[PDB]
Scaffold this active site. Structure first.
Site, PDB file in Angstrom:
ATOM      1  N   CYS A  38       1.102  -0.758  -0.088  1.00 49.22           N
ATOM      2  CA  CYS A  38      -0.154   0.057   0.341  1.00 49.22           C
ATOM      3  C   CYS A  38       0.911   1.357   0.039  1.00 49.22           C
ATOM      4  CB  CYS A  38      -0.915  -0.211   1.541  1.00 49.22           C
ATOM      5  SG  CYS A  38      -2.421   1.566   1.235  1.00 49.22           S
ATOM      6  N   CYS A  41      -0.014   3.510   2.282  1.00 45.76           N
ATOM      7  CA  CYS A  41       0.129   3.521   3.680  1.00 45.76           C
ATOM      8  C   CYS A  41       1.745   3.480   4.065  1.00 45.76           C
ATOM      9  CB  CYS A  41       0.047   1.949   3.655  1.00 45.76           C
ATOM     10  SG  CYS A  41      -1.418   1.564   4.243  1.00 45.76           S
TER      11      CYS A  41
END
Length: 115
Positions: A38, A41
């Site tokens: 991600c 993230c």
């Protein structure tokens, strides 16, 4: 003097039982949901590491969504990253997406205003 033994960036959550134990505490707590694949993230890892140092009165826990998908499903998390704010098993607010500034604002506001 810098003798070398480093605090973890976060409380790294290893199980749903551990998650529930953390979130049950009478301590303002931020749990944020991360995955290795991600991009957004990974983008906010350093802002959130700094934020944990800035608010030592708050527990910052990281859930690895790939290792612990059960915690993702328990909160019905749909987008990564997400941060949830809790105390004594109650949820006080969330920030969906890569928005460290909004998270910091919500944490500061809760700390400012509590008894």
């Amino acid at each position: 003097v810098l003798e070398e033994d480093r605090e973890p960036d976060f409380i790294e959550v290893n199980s749903l039982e551990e998650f529930d134990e953390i979130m049950s505490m009478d301590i303002l707590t931020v749990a944020w949901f991360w995955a290795e694949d991600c991009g957004p993230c990974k983008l906010i890892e350093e802002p959130l590491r700094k934020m944990a140092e800035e608010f030592p009165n708050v527990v910052f826990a990281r859930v690895d969504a790939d290792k612990n998908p059960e915690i993702v499903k328990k909160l019905n998390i749909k987008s990564l990253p997400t941060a949830v704010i809790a105390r004594s098993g109650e949820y006080l607010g969330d920030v969906v997406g890569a928005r460290p500034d909004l998270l910091r604002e919500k944490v500061e506001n809760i700390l400012k205003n509590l008894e």
